[PDB]
2,3-butanediol dehydrogenase (Serratia marcescens), 1006 residues
Amino acid sequence: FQGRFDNKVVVITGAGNGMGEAAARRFSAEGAIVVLADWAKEAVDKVAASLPKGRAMAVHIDVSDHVAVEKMMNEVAEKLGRIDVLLNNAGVHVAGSVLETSIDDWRRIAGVDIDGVVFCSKFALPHLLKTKGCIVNTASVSGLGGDWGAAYYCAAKGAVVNLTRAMALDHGGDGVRINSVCPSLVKTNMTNGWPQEIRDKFNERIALGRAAEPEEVAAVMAFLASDDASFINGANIPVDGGATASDGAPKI
Amino acid sequence: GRFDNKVVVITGAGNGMGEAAARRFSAEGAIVVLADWAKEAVDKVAASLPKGRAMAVHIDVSDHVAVEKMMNEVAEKLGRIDVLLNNAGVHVAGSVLETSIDDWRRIAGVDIDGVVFCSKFALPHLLKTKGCIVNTASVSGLGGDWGAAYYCAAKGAVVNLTRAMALDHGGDGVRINSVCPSLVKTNMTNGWPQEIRDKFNERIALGRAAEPEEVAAVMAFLASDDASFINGANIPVDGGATASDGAPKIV
Amino acid sequence: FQGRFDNKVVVITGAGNGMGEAAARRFSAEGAIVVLADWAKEAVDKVAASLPKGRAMAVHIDVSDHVAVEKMMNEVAEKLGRIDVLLNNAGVHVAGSVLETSIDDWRRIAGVDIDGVVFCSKFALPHLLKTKGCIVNTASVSGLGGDWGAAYYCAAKGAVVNLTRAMALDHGGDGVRINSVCPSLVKTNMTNGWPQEIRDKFNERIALGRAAEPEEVAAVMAFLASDDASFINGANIPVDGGATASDGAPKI
Amino acid sequence: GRFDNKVVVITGAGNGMGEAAARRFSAEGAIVVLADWAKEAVDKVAASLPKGRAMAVHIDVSDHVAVEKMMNEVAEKLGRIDVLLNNAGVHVAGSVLETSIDDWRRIAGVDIDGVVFCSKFALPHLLKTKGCIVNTASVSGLGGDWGAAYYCAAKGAVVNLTRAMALDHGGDGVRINSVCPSLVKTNMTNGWPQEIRDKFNERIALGRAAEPEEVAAVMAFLASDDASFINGANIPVDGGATASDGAPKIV
Ligand SMILES: NC(=O)c1ccc[n+]([C@@H]2O[C@H](COP(=O)([O-])OP(=O)(O)OC[C@H]3O[C@@H](n4cnc5c(N)ncnc54)[C@H](O)[C@@H]3O)[C@@H](O)[C@H]2O)c1
Ligand SMILES: NC(=O)c1ccc[n+]([C@@H]2O[C@H](COP(=O)([O-])OP(=O)(O)OC[C@H]3O[C@@H](n4cnc5c(N)ncnc54)[C@H](O)[C@@H]3O)[C@@H](O)[C@H]2O)c1
Ligand SMILES: NC(=O)c1ccc[n+]([C@@H]2O[C@H](COP(=O)([O-])OP(=O)(O)OC[C@H]3O[C@@H](n4cnc5c(N)ncnc54)[C@H](O)[C@@H]3O)[C@@H](O)[C@H]2O)c1
Ligand SMILES: NC(=O)c1ccc[n+]([C@@H]2O[C@H](COP(=O)([O-])OP(=O)(O)OC[C@H]3O[C@@H](n4cnc5c(N)ncnc54)[C@H](O)[C@@H]3O)[C@@H](O)[C@H]2O)c1
Ligand SMILES: Nc1ncnc2c1ncn2[C@@H]1O[C@H](COP(=O)(O)OP(=O)(O)O)[C@@H](O)[C@H]1O
Ligand SMILES: Nc1ncnc2c1ncn2[C@@H]1O[C@H](COP(=O)(O)OP(=O)(O)O)[C@@H](O)[C@H]1O
Ligand code: NA
Ligand code: NA
Ligand code: NA
Ligand code: NA
């Protein structure tokens, strides 16, 4: 894998979260120039400073802001001369049915989880078309099926999963492949803090019996951006240890 | 009499599948609330149905303030809501590169926000009647199209919102399902060229576009007691469109 | 619904099981001439004798036997002059992973659950084409997704679900619609005998919080055979109270 | 060295995607067992690979007695099995009305029974290595075709067997997944007329048939440590074929 992404420019939104950092490190190890784009400063600055000098840069972005996103994509292309890979990894979650969640909760979910993927993809694509680059969306198993108690989140991830399909049809023939990863439970500080009773309920539904490490999702992002994935287009790859392979029946 | 004295709220009721649903539910005894932003069109449909059993509301379903008011006024005036058909929708053709931010806001406002808001504000009333929701999604929410990116994102949202809300509310006696039509003979597609429409007859195994009555028929079924164990389903009404793996005919 | 299937000939395989009997009664109530086809005699004889005289007949069939199935379909067509509806409702289940289940278990699952649908559909179709009739397959949620501990059964029901699609493409344009119902847990003597701990685990996965009555599955079969389903072709309708609408995550 | 000294059993290894997998796994350090009923073809592939690191088995995978023997002999002789590629397959074109009971038995024997039997008899060995299975399914197992009914039933079985076995064995450290190609340039499709093949370039967004190496690449990925959290997945390698809702292009 040494040199798989040598001198490729990889723009990573939501670069300051577990999967974002793992993606930045994996692509960086394989020779990429990473742009770590996030709202928050501290996390992406710390990651960028850990990576080879001149091969990583941190930016502030609100992915829900189309004017800011267009500017970021054009400045990155101007400064680095190219964009090869977009990882749409920004995310917000809010828990609840539509009865437990507000219009504001909807706007927060929709702005980042839907509008961010639409805007970053639309404004990166002209650059990707020049390099025959690709997009990898961070969707979710929550976009392939429903959850109890995350209605707006499921709507937004459902939008990303089907937008991945539609855009793959629109652009794949012009040499830009568009795919998603659909993770389940990812080991984070939030999941490390869960009681055993909660964590055991999740592990029972996943045949592999554990949460994904963020490196395990990053690995699939790197594969989907690689020449080995040359015939994978419009795919929403479950990275879920078997979660969505079930018909919903309990394990007996 | 399948829907005798059931209150049925139908968005996009002034034309096409909404109008066809209004007539079908009305014929089966429903009191029908016809919601549309096309005022002349929805007034004409309302006036065509039996007196005292149909009322028109001039509303943009993208507007949460207008939607909350409609749902509460309907519930107050008629005493109940039994069925919501989230049918109002608009289409725009093109990739994200050929369609504007404004095109996105129009698609998202009607096709996603409308469904979210109407569902949210009807649900407290549906819980009292053990009522149901039927969303008009599309095959374009079960898979992608060439040249309708924003529309596909919006319909994808409707398909998975259908699933999530069914898990949330099915246990409290409110079933939530969708219909997913392919080509239907309506104002939405009557501008589409013969080249495109003829290819649908190749991609749809039944070899024709659907009549709007044929989707209305499935909406009525999904709201009926015969659908008592169907929940969170996105029912293709597509003559076989989504049954295909995408391959052209092998022979 | 009085007269919806007036004088239509409805051939029901596996007519002696819960869903079969419920289908026979529902179609019979709506005016159909029912042929109740099953291996076993007592159950279908009792149902046929309960239904209007001259409007129900019981037959013995092994649906896994192509020679016997061709003969049954041609004799029914000759005797009644027509076939309008085929309900492929025969089934066997065997529990276990491929490590816990034998070659014989595979042959038993495959013969009835796959070969029966292939053979009955192939030999009924010439008759269905004359009436512009339809097929409704009894598939399962176990054909739309996997189970723990029913590997062969899941393979066979997966075959029925995709054969439903393929045959719908082949025949829908010649006026024979082909669809399936995909039930979850159906209330039977087997499920009535389950301990509360087992039944509670099933009910938790189903948003409606209960097993389907066989009448509730029969209702969907009758709909799929009706003129109201004129544009439904190649569909595998979940009749599962929400079971397959889940992404597999536990309810919290 | 990704597969250094891993034993990889490949059915249908004498041609097409099987042969391409044998060469790819061999280049990455695997010892490759090439199983095929085409004896000259699989012997030529085996003889092309590094001495001591490839062996041919002349076997009909539809035969459970032959398959159990192969799996146990391979395990005894090489001490282990790390990867099974259930790739052997045959195609027949036609509806059930145009294809015979014998056509069915041939399709089912190879395309279903072969996968069931090879999986069943390799699994005890894979459990010892925390190995994996990659099934060659098809888009024709994720949806239907016009004119390949028996093939679609068989591939549908492979797709859902992949899911069920992943739930059964994933917890014991054996991942089970499939690749689902659309049109690939192999002996299976080289007889298909230009009319049909040209329409695939329309239905596949990438606008071409796959090279067999492009599916072999995904087989190697699914057997690799990078796929450590992918289990029960049916991965489309189809240039977009199944991403479509079936509709022809909208513009
Ligand atoms: N016609 C097709 O081929 C097809 C296929 C799949 C799904 N659909 C869906 O069917 C639904 C109905 O559309 P149709 O085909 O019957 O078209 P139509 O144009 O006949 O009817 C749509 C109706 O919705 C109304 N409407 C639009 N936006 C609205 C808003 N913001 N507030 C209130 N009313 C609004 C329109 O005025 C119109 O009366 C839509 O959701 C559409 O996406 C259409
Ligand atoms: N902000 C809003 O309130 C808003 C926004 C958009 C449109 N609308 C309403 O939508 C309605 C339609 O106006 P429009 O500007 O969209 O026109 P339009 O673009 O819909 O033109 C007429 C449409 O209906 C079809 N049509 C034409 N003659 C018809 C007939 N006799 N019967 C049925 N269908 C016919 C046409 O093919 C076309 O689809 C108006 O009532 C308008 O006020 C509301
Ligand atoms: N080529 C395509 O377009 C395509 C698309 C989707 C999936 N597939 C699947 O790919 C797999 C490989 O086929 P291919 O396209 O590389 O074709 P191929 O003809 O190049 O190779 C298939 C190989 O399987 C062998 N084989 C067949 N039946 C066998 C049996 N009973 N026992 C042992 N070996 C047997 C053949 O001799 C041949 O060497 C099959 O499962 C096929 O269904 C093919
Ligand atoms: N019962 C069995 O053991 C059984 C059953 C069927 C076939 N087979 C074996 O399958 C093999 C193929 O024989 P067949 O009768 O299927 O022939 P065939 O029908 O496969 O004819 C040759 C096939 O390979 C292709 N081909 C032709 N020349 C080629 C070349 N130089 N390189 C690569 N591919 C080429 C052709 O396009 C065609 O697909 C034989 O070894 C046969 O014994 C085994
Ligand atoms: N509007 C936004 N613009 C850019 N990045 C954002 C925006 N909203 C959230 N992000 C970033 O996306 C990443 C993923 O968010 P989230 O999933 O909430 O984080 P976590 O995985 O830490 O819970 C975070 O690093 C977050 O700061
Ligand atoms: N080979 C066969 N030919 C015809 N009918 C069969 C065959 N095998 C089983 N059946 C019938 O199919 C029906 C469904 O079988 P099964 O699901 O095992 O029954 P149950 O629902 O009572 O458990 C039964 O009435 C059974 O007798
Ligand atoms: Na995960
Ligand atoms: Na129009
Ligand atoms: Na059920
Ligand atoms: Na050939």
In short: The helical segments of chain A are 18-29, 42-50, 66-80, 103-131, 151-171, 189-192, 196-205, 214-225. Chain A is about 45% helix and 15% strand. Chain A has one domain: 1-252. The pocket of adenosine-5'-diphosphate (ligand 5) is lined by residues A 13-14, 16-18, 20, 38-40, 61-64, 90-92, 112, 188 (CB under 6 Å).
